[PDB]
Amino acid sequence: TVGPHFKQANNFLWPFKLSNPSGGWGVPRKFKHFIQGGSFGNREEFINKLVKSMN
Amino acid sequence: EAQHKLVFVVRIKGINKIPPKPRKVLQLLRLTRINSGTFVKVTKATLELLKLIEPY
Amino acid sequence: GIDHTSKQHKRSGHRTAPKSDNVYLKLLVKLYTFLARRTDAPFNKVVLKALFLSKINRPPVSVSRIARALKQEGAANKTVVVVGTVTDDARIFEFPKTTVAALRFTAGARAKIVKAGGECITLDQLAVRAPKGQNTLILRGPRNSREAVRHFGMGPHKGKAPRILSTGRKFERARGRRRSKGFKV
Amino acid sequence: GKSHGYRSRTRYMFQRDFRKHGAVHLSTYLKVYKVGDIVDIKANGSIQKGMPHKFYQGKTGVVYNVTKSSVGVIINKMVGNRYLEKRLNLRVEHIKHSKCRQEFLERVKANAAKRAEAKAQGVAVQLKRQPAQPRESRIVSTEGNVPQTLAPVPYETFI
Amino acid sequence: AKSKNHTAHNQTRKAHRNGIKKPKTYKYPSLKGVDPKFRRNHKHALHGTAKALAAAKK
Amino acid sequence: MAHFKEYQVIGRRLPTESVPEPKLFRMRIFASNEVIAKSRYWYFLQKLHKVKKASGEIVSINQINEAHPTKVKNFGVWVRYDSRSGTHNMYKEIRDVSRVAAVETLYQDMAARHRARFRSIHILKVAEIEKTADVKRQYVKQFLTKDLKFPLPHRVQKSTKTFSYKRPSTFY
RNA sequence: GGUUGCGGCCAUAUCUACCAGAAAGCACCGUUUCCCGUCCGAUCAACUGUAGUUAAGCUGGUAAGAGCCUGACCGAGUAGUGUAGUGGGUGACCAUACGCGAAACUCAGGUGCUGCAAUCU
RNA sequence: GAGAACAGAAAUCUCCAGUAGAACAAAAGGGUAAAAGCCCCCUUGAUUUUGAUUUUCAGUGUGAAUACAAACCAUGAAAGU
RNA sequence: GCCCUGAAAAUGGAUGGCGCUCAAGCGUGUUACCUAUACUCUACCGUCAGGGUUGAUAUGAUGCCCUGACGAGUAGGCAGG
RNA sequence: AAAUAUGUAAGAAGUCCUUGUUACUUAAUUGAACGUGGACAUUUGAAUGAAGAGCUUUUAGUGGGCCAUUUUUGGUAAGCAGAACUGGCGAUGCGGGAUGAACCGAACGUAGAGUUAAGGUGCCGGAAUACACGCUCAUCAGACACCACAAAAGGUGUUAG
RNA sequence: GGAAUACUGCCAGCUGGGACUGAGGACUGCGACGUAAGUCAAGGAUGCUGGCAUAAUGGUUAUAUGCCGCCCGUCUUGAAACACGGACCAAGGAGUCUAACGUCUAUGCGAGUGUUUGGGUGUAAAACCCAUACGCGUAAUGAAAGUGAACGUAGGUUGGGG
RNA sequence: GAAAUUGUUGAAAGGGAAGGGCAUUUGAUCAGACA
Ligand SMILES: [Mg+2]
Ligand SMILES: [Mg+2]
Ligand SMILES: [Mg+2]
Ligand SMILES: [Mg+2]
Ligand SMILES: [Mg+2]
Ligand SMILES: [Mg+2]
Ligand SMILES: [Mg+2]
Ligand SMILES: [Mg+2]
Ligand SMILES: [Mg+2]
Ligand SMILES: [Mg+2]
Ligand SMILES: [Mg+2]
Ligand SMILES: [Mg+2]
Ligand SMILES: [Mg+2]
Ligand SMILES: [Mg+2]
Ligand SMILES: [Mg+2]
Ligand SMILES: [Mg+2]
Ligand SMILES: [Mg+2]
Ligand SMILES: [Mg+2]
Ligand SMILES: [Mg+2]
Ligand SMILES: [Mg+2]
Ligand SMILES: [Mg+2]
Ligand SMILES: [Mg+2]
Ligand SMILES: [Mg+2]
Ligand SMILES: [Mg+2]
Ligand SMILES: [Mg+2]
Ligand SMILES: [Mg+2]
Ligand SMILES: [Mg+2]
Ligand SMILES: [Mg+2]
Ligand SMILES: [Mg+2]
Ligand SMILES: [Mg+2]
Ligand SMILES: [Mg+2]
Ligand SMILES: [Mg+2]
Ligand SMILES: [Mg+2]
Ligand SMILES: [Mg+2]
Ligand SMILES: [Mg+2]
Ligand SMILES: [Mg+2]
Ligand SMILES: [Mg+2]
Ligand SMILES: [Mg+2]
Ligand SMILES: [Mg+2]
Ligand SMILES: [Mg+2]
Ligand SMILES: [Mg+2]
Ligand SMILES: [Mg+2]
Ligand SMILES: [Mg+2]
Ligand SMILES: [Mg+2]
Ligand SMILES: [Mg+2]
Ligand SMILES: [Mg+2]
Ligand SMILES: [Mg+2]
Ligand SMILES: [Mg+2]
Ligand SMILES: [Mg+2]
Ligand SMILES: [Mg+2]
Ligand SMILES: [Mg+2]
Ligand SMILES: [Mg+2]
Ligand SMILES: [Mg+2]
Ligand SMILES: [Mg+2]
Ligand SMILES: [Mg+2]
Ligand SMILES: [Mg+2]
Ligand SMILES: [Mg+2]
Ligand SMILES: [Mg+2]
Ligand SMILES: [Mg+2]
Ligand SMILES: [Mg+2]
Ligand SMILES: [Mg+2]
Ligand SMILES: [Mg+2]
Ligand SMILES: [Mg+2]
Ligand SMILES: [Mg+2]
Ligand SMILES: [Mg+2]
């Protein structure tokens, strides 16, 4: 919800350490942008399928 | 839809050969290690941060 | 790998025990760490670390510097604590009474305290009288009055006292020390 | 060989602002400075006396002293890995009052207002500044406005 | 035997290890450089209000 | 760029107090997901109006499904494509069952014949060729003749083990 | 509103050409005993407010005026640019991805505002 | 630019236009128009004392420069310089 | 666009080799798959840090117990051996 | 007249009231400076982070550097010479580029399971002689960055415009 | 007109095959299931069965096989180098001691401190004892003649552990 | 009575060096631990 206390709430959480994705990255090269067929930058709602494969 | 106020960032890039300015932003966002994610609330003042680190 | 934001495996940099080997000092420590663990009292935590400090960071507190601190308003019935030796000062002609808890009192210093009907107490005697350090006044000696700090920060226009053996004129007083020879500092 | 003199490299830096040459207008000398003011430094090529060195061009500092024709300014200039305190003696022609604090001075007497005018009302303040937030949802109408469909255009030449 | 003339290479890495330390602020800065005419009188002004606050405890 | 979808994308020109309710432009965009399509939308709008994504807003994004996905259609296509030595417009014709299938093999063709990667091509227009004999290109016309038939000579069957005991037959 | 004295900003106040300006003011204007200055009472100085004049200054208005000022999804999201790739090309160079973004141009509007004191149908 | 005996491309005289297109020792770049340029009038502050400051910098020295303080003076009706 | 001509050097020889021609070539798409001292989880060693513990009547107080994070290295420093 | 880069500010060392000191300054208790007394607490004044911050002393080695992207000077050029910002190598192994100081990936305690990166999967050789649409037949075809070169100019070869 | 389906997403829905690991060592916590008593998969593996009791398992070693592996030392931007030294082995073989010193640290004593020139004494180069001096410190500043440290609770102000 | 280095005897390997790392087969050898 991005609460009034989000700053204290979020800083309390240690940075999540995810594993590499399980289905791989779906791309041949990570270091272009998502739009360019790589993995980086804002991929919007697609951050979930990635993060889920890394969690 | 009201544009998203909450974003989750995971560092995709390894530790080395990173220019200084993106490299500090990475630290201040607590992504100092590969595949380590955090939550970031979206405002202009963190939006510019996400801009600096997009390739990593 | 981790992009390291700070130097890894860094020691606190603060003394942990005394570097001294004196059993009694070790025993005094043993006392005050216990006290400092279980009393939640600021005085004991401070006193613990003062026992760690080297002879340089324990400048002597003079009996006259003591007499002064009791002239603070409401300070005259407090017991002064000096973690370190206490020295005599022939320059005060009237020393008050009090009770002084130190590591050491020089011959002359303990005399003058007792001659006025005061009390010289070892730190452990003070722990028994004041476990939480009640009614105490801690005094530190003048750290930076060592001869060595005179020469620290030596350099142009710093006014800092050369490292010199023989002195007088003819010794490091001419070119660079005065406008008429070369320049001035 | 090399040439490193005091005004070296300052060709356009001390130049006069096109069609702005000539006397300095009289307000520049009616302005009044006190110790503690923040001033901006811009050197005026027309006044050769009391000129700041080119390093302090475009630099802001705090006046530490006030004399007949001049104000002293202190500037933190960083040499090596540290900052040192430089104090400069400047003619008033090279110095203007800084606006750098006006949004703070505006906001203090404003935050004082909505403080009193709230507490005396029964609190509910929120006077810290917030960044640009993402915008809310909204409903855009089609009334009088139907989408106009555009496509990419072909290659032309026209020269 | 020619050799490299100069570079600033590596110099801002060195500067940033221990440093670019911020300027060190103080309440009550020095009067160093302040007008003697001002400062001479100021010496007396303070001595005046100091003498005042003494006769304020009597 | 992938298996393609088609997207109505609508965006406008952020509101101002002096100019509320700005003008609302639509584009159809072939993209593999909705994130490319929005980037692609903004790519063309900055090529036409004075806007950039910063000063503007996407009002809506909608997938368009083929109206008759099982009916074979003859498509003419209109393309602008940069090449090494200069940029050129084109018209090709594609026979397939969906606009999305059409755009797929277009991009494949531009890559095979003209060495054009996805970034170089612009789709100008794709539209259904309604009457036949508005088909203008011979490689499609071949397939519109009445009572069409062809054999598939020299048939090659994929073997599932390293050895065979017979000897193949390309018969069919 | 006018005008004057002293101004602030210092062309929306400047430039070119014409036309108009009541009352007051300013001005042009008259004299050379005096202080004062010149090759020359033109400038400068003194004396008159008398003997004359709106001609000039000055103020204002006119002009598909020159200039200048302001604005605009006019041009142009162009040129340039920060960031990215084991992108294209023999190369020169170029395209794309996330951002920032001019200048000319074109068009429209405009042509001093204003502080203190005195004065005036 | 337009005018005046010898006088001509160039002599001295006059009016108009003139944003500096000139000059300010010198290289160049700044700067400057009731001036910073030209002519004249009066002068010695190009003086005395000892600090601070800026550039170069190690924040040493030297060179050069800045803004005050304390004299004694110049000049101008004066503010001032 | 690909291909061909343009296209000449010295021991025999190199898309790494074999070999490959609706490729095992060129462009482009889609899946699966392989494997770094990297990432995730666990054990153990060490370093640093934060806690806890002098109550006797047994054996370590520089000790004992809990918990977390970290670990490349020439010249070089210090430390424990 | 940009982009990038750059100075300062974002409070308790703050803000407002009252009215003391002086030899400075004012026509002047005018001001200037420093104050005595009084009013308002942490949504006390943007974001994010903070294995804390501040400070002192002493001493090693070094004072031949070299490379890459971008900016860039001299030179026809150079694996040439000289600058700028960053990142590397030097001082550093590990996976990849066959090979290789500097490229890509990723930085090292001893190990187990899993997942990957860059790069690959006919056979050498772990891994599809996978799927799909085209293109190409070379009497010196071609085959992946840095990279181990090829140009003008031509073809009634073939492909699509 | 009424459904189905694909695609994407969610379920604190159920369920199968496989792999590695089993750190800890009474109790203590948070819970779960039960009417209950009890029970449990809830702050880290137990139960049941079998085999050998041995070179079976394990260590060492030689060999073979798969993959990998250039010569060390040195100076150097860069060495396996077509740079140098080194055929082999043993044994020697290089930051020392002294004078005077800086920072730090331990210790004694402290406005002082230093017995060891010397003397006394001795179980005799040791240990023990000691008068006078001297050294450094306790005053500074001037080239020098010289002069020489409280207006005050040994000052005011701001921060300041306790 | 070491080492370099040599003879004999025993064992083993050897298609243009040898030596080394991880791992296992085979041979040789050996510790501990069952009860
Ligand atoms: Mg799967
Ligand atoms: Mg898998
Ligand atoms: Mg790849
Ligand atoms: Mg997982
Ligand atoms: Mg965060
Ligand atoms: Mg001394
Ligand atoms: Mg002293
Ligand atoms: Mg030069
Ligand atoms: Mg220099
Ligand atoms: Mg001068
Ligand atoms: Mg030489
Ligand atoms: Mg060289
Ligand atoms: Mg050098
Ligand atoms: Mg009249
Ligand atoms: Mg008229
Ligand atoms: Mg007038
Ligand atoms: Mg006009
Ligand atoms: Mg490129
Ligand atoms: Mg470009
Ligand atoms: Mg030099
Ligand atoms: Mg010079
Ligand atoms: Mg292959
Ligand atoms: Mg292919
Ligand atoms: Mg490992
Ligand atoms: Mg290490
Ligand atoms: Mg050890
Ligand atoms: Mg900044
Ligand atoms: Mg925080
Ligand atoms: Mg902390
Ligand atoms: Mg050194
Ligand atoms: Mg040195
Ligand atoms: Mg040198
Ligand atoms: Mg690099
Ligand atoms: Mg080296
Ligand atoms: Mg390195
Ligand atoms: Mg490396
Ligand atoms: Mg290669
Ligand atoms: Mg390699
Ligand atoms: Mg890169
Ligand atoms: Mg082979
Ligand atoms: Mg295989
Ligand atoms: Mg290629
Ligand atoms: Mg290339
Ligand atoms: Mg052709
Ligand atoms: Mg399972
Ligand atoms: Mg166990
Ligand atoms: Mg056995
Ligand atoms: Mg065995
Ligand atoms: Mg046995
Ligand atoms: Mg054997
Ligand atoms: Mg090998
Ligand atoms: Mg060499
Ligand atoms: Mg060689
Ligand atoms: Mg040699
Ligand atoms: Mg030799
Ligand atoms: Mg030996
Ligand atoms: Mg004897
Ligand atoms: Mg005796
Ligand atoms: Mg005697
Ligand atoms: Mg002496
Ligand atoms: Mg003396
Ligand atoms: Mg013998
Ligand atoms: Mg071996
Ligand atoms: Mg046995
Ligand atoms: Mg046994």
Resolution limit, Å: 3.1
3-state secondary structure C116-131: CCCEEEEHHHHHHHCC
Amino acid at D29: Y
What single letter denotes the amino acid at residue C165? L
Cβ–Cβ under 8 Å, residues F136 and F77: no
Cα of E50 to nearest chain D Cα, Å = 23
- Chains near D (3 or more Cβ pairs under 8 Å): B, E, F
Compute the CA torsion angle B51, B54, C1, C4 (nearest 10 deg).
-10
Which ranges in F20-172 belong to alpha helices (H)? 34-45, 99-112, 138-141
Residue of F nearest to D135 (CA): F57
Q: Do domains F3-69 and F70-146 have the same CATH topology?
A: yes
Question: What architecture is domain F70-146?
Answer: Roll (3.10)
Residue C5 in contact with residue B27, Cβ under 8 Å? yes
CB contact under 8 A, A2 and B6: yes
Cβ–Cβ under 8 Å, residues B4 and B42: yes
Architecture of domain F3-69: Roll (3.10)
Antiparallel, parallel or unpaired: β F25-31 and D82-91:
unpaired
List E residues 13-42 in contact with D (Cβ-Cβ < 8 A). 14-16, 18-24, 29, 32-35, 38
Contact D140 F122 (CB under 8 A): no
Residue F1, CB, less than 7 Å from strand I?
A: yes
Q: Are C131 and C40 spatial neighbours (Cβ–Cβ below 8 Å)?
A: no
The C1' atom of K65 and the CA atom of D152 lie apart, in whole Å, by 67
First-to-last C-alpha distance (Å) of chain E:
83
From CA D60, how far away is CA D96, in angstroms rounded?
Answer: 10
Query: Could you please report the per-residue DSSP string of F51-84?
Result: --GGG--EEEEEEE--SSTTS-EEEEEEEEEE-S
Residues surrounding ion ligand 11 at CB below 5 Å: E 1
CB of B14 lies under 7 Å from some atom of strand I = yes
Task: Identify which of E25, E33, E42 has the alpha carbon closest to the alpha carbon of residue D65.
Answer: E33
Delimit the domains of chain F by residue range.
Answer: 3-69, 70-146
- D89 sits in which H/E element: strand D82-91
Task: Identify the experimental approach.
Answer: X-ray
